[PDB]
């Protein structure tokens, strides 16, 4: 679950797969700019630390 421990998970350090659940959401850009605004819940690893 996003915002807590295990927001992203990998079976192994060398494994290619990944499962991430971080609620990454997009927003409409403001007039007269090119910037791709997004919002996202902060990483769980930092807050567990």
């Amino acid at each position: 679950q996003p915002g807590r421990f295990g927001d992203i998970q990998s079976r192994t350090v060398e494994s290619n797969d990944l499962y991430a659940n971080t609620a990454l959401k997009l927003a409409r850009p403001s007039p007269g700019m090119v910037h791709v605004p997004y919002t996202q819940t902060p990483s769980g690893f930092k807050y567990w630390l």
Binding site: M33, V34, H35
Partner: protein, 262 residues
């Protein structure tokens, strides 16, 4: 050996504010700040690459930067990285700059332009380090233990790292159109400008030399320098040239290594 920093050029991006509370396209735009070093040493990223002259030669004095689709160089001195106080600069190569700063809430990077004006970009960043161990000291003492920790090295060997480059977009401009009398001319200098007009079925395509319309006013033709010839960057603040993209790969300097701290 290889000189990978020949197919890269500085670009101009959009900065949140220029040190005074107003936003304008600066050549010193600040990209992501990485701070995964245990002793607390930041890897800031410019938009204008450093340590290389205009002529693609490794020089410890000339720093490249972009201005109106033209590359100029400035003196390495006056490169100031600032936080609540005044930081110290350790490394310098490519787009990346290694800094050590006192605790603070925002950081700015500033350089002198060709005509000696300050160009500065400022970004919010809650920097507050904690030294490794169980005591929250400030500077190393002259008698203590040794603990392993991590930091960024100055070596530039193989690093197994990625940064993505792509061909720059069609840069728009309006200076190159000059209206004299019922006609306009397009400025030249090597920029194979792409043009699109509306008067009389218009004229669609790209040219390489001076051209004249003789038919309509300025507000129907457009100047879009294609440039090409050189990878710029994958930045969020500049558009792409094709949907499926092309993408490139460049190794960044300053990897991570183990050291000992006191």
């Amino acid at each position: 050996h290889f000189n990978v920093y020949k197919a890269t050029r500085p670009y101009i991006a959009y900065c949140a504010d220029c040190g005074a509370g107003h936003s304008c396209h600066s050549p010193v735009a600040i990209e992501a700040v990485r701070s995964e070093a245990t002793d607390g040493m930041l890897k800031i990223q410019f938009s204008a690459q450093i340590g290389i002259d205009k002529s693609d030669n490794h020089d410890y004095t000339k720093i490249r930067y972009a201005d109106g689709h033209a590359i100029e160089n400035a003196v390495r001195s006056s490169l100031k990285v600032a936080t609540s106080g005044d930081c110290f600069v350790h490394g310098t190569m490519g787009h990346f700059i290694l800094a050590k700063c006192p605790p603070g809430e925002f950081l700015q990077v500033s350089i002198q332009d060709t005509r000696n004006a300050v160009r500065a970009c400022r970004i919010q960043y809650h920097h507050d380090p904690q030294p490794v161990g169980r005591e929250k000291f400030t500077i190393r003492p002259h008698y203590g233990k040794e603990i392993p920790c991590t930091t960024y090295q100055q070596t530039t060997a193989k690093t197994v790292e990625e940064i993505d480059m792509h061909m720059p977009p069609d840069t728009p401009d309006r200076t190159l159109l000059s209206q004299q009398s019922g006609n306009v001319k397009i400025t030249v200098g090597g920029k194979k400008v792409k043009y699109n007009c509306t008067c009389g079925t218009g004229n669609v395509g790209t040219t390489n030399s001076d051209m004249t319309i003789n038919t309509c006013l300025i507000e129907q033709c457009h100047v879009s320098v294609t440039d090409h010839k050189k990878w710029q960057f994958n930045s969020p603040f500049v558009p792409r040239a094709d949907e499926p993209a092309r993408k490139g790969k460049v190794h960044i300097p300053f990897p991570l290594d183990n050291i000992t701290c006191r």
